[PDB]
Design an enzyme around this catalytic site. Sequence first.
Site, mmCIF file in Angstrom:
data_model
loop_
_atom_site.group_PDB
_atom_site.id
_atom_site.type_symbol
_atom_site.label_atom_id
_atom_site.label_comp_id
_atom_site.label_asym_id
_atom_site.label_seq_id
_atom_site.Cartn_x
_atom_site.Cartn_y
_atom_site.Cartn_z
ATOM 1 C CG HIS A 133 3.800 10.235 -3.565
ATOM 2 N ND1 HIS A 133 2.824 11.175 -3.761
ATOM 3 C CD2 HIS A 133 3.196 9.026 -3.647
ATOM 4 C CE1 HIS A 133 1.670 10.555 -3.981
ATOM 5 N NE2 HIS A 133 1.871 9.240 -3.908
ATOM 6 C CD1 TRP A 168 -1.916 -2.271 1.925
ATOM 7 C CD2 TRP A 168 -3.187 -1.157 0.458
ATOM 8 N NE1 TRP A 168 -3.019 -3.041 1.665
ATOM 9 C CE2 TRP A 168 -3.813 -2.386 0.767
ATOM 10 C CE3 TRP A 168 -3.804 -0.288 -0.451
ATOM 11 C CZ2 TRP A 168 -5.026 -2.764 0.199
ATOM 12 C CZ3 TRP A 168 -5.012 -0.656 -1.000
ATOM 13 C CH2 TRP A 168 -5.609 -1.878 -0.679
ATOM 14 C CD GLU A 194 -1.426 2.282 -3.147
ATOM 15 O OE1 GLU A 194 -0.353 2.588 -3.575
ATOM 16 O OE2 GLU A 194 -1.698 2.367 -2.001
ATOM 17 C CG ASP A 208 -1.416 9.792 -3.143
ATOM 18 O OD1 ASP A 208 -1.085 9.120 -4.141
ATOM 19 O OD2 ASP A 208 -0.812 9.784 -2.045
ATOM 20 C CB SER A 254 7.536 6.811 -2.613
ATOM 21 O OG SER A 254 6.252 7.316 -2.936
HETATM 22 ZN ZN LIG Z 1 0.485 7.782 -4.008
#
Ligand SMILES: [Zn+2]
EC number: 3.4.17.-
Lengths: 183, 181
Positions: free
Chosen positions: B101, B92, B151, B108, B99
Amino acid sequence: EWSLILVNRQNPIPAQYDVELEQLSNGERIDIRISPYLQDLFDAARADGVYPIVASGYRTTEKQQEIMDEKVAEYKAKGYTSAQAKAEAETWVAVPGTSEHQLGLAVDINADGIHSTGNEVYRWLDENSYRFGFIRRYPPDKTEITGVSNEPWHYRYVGIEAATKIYHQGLCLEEYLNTEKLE
Amino acid sequence: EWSLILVNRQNPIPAQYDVELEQLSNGERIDIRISPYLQDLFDAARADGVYPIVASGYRTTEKQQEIMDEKVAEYKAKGYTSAQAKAEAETWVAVPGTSEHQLGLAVDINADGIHSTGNEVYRWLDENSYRFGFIRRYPPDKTEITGVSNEPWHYRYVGIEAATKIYHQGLCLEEYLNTEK
Ligand SMILES: [Zn+2]
Ligand SMILES: [Zn+2]
């Protein structure tokens, strides 16, 4: 006195409030003025084997809107008209322009989870934060004065002198300020 | 091409990777290079009566760390061993260093709550994100390849040509970069 500014439903942030933000390692931001006090707090907690995080620091108006709207969405999904959801969400989340988080004087502290649970961090902060200028802003025994539910993460920098008095006095910030204005 | 970098346990973020960050109005940060595309995406969304928010852009190592530790703690609390909790948590949340990010190329995206629901946004993005050069990075049917769970909020900037290809070909990023070979 700068650290004692009151921000609530009835006391919105002044127009053109200046704030110099420091960036923390996690990317959250705080008023540079509270940095060494917050650092001392985290240092102390860790020395007690308590491991906190800053979940939320400075938030912009827009940011405060999105948290609020998410909170409203949660209550709509639990069987609330959007009118009911708004009023109810507002006991958890300050409408934009009334969150302390918009000052950079509020941190929402949580457990890192792996070394510490939420409850241990929350306990520790409740008993200790005042020594570093932070108050438990929204204690369960004062929701009828603050307008805000029990929020055991939300800590407000007010400074050591004031936090200690508030903690001993067993008061919320509104009461403390009201009692300061009276005498 | 700079925008196609793969990032996973095998491909940790390069040492001294260069992010060039911009603050959005909610305080989230994105690489400045993806700014015009994200703006075009929100414009098109809003135009379609769909109301998204950036819940998460750029993240520091430490921020990534904190999310991952919070996820791990949720699994430990529901009876998973330390090693299982981490394993589970990793499907998750990427480990710091891995990442997207931390590239500032990932966002997101959630609903604004009161105008749209998450599913309406998730649906819309699903069908429209590639036009702005973002992909639904972790589709449900590729969790084996990507090593990440469905996700539907996580969108990776790869570029319009790139995203468009991947979307029509129906593939995940891993797959397309192996296509290139
Ligand atoms: Zn994300
Ligand atoms: Zn708070």
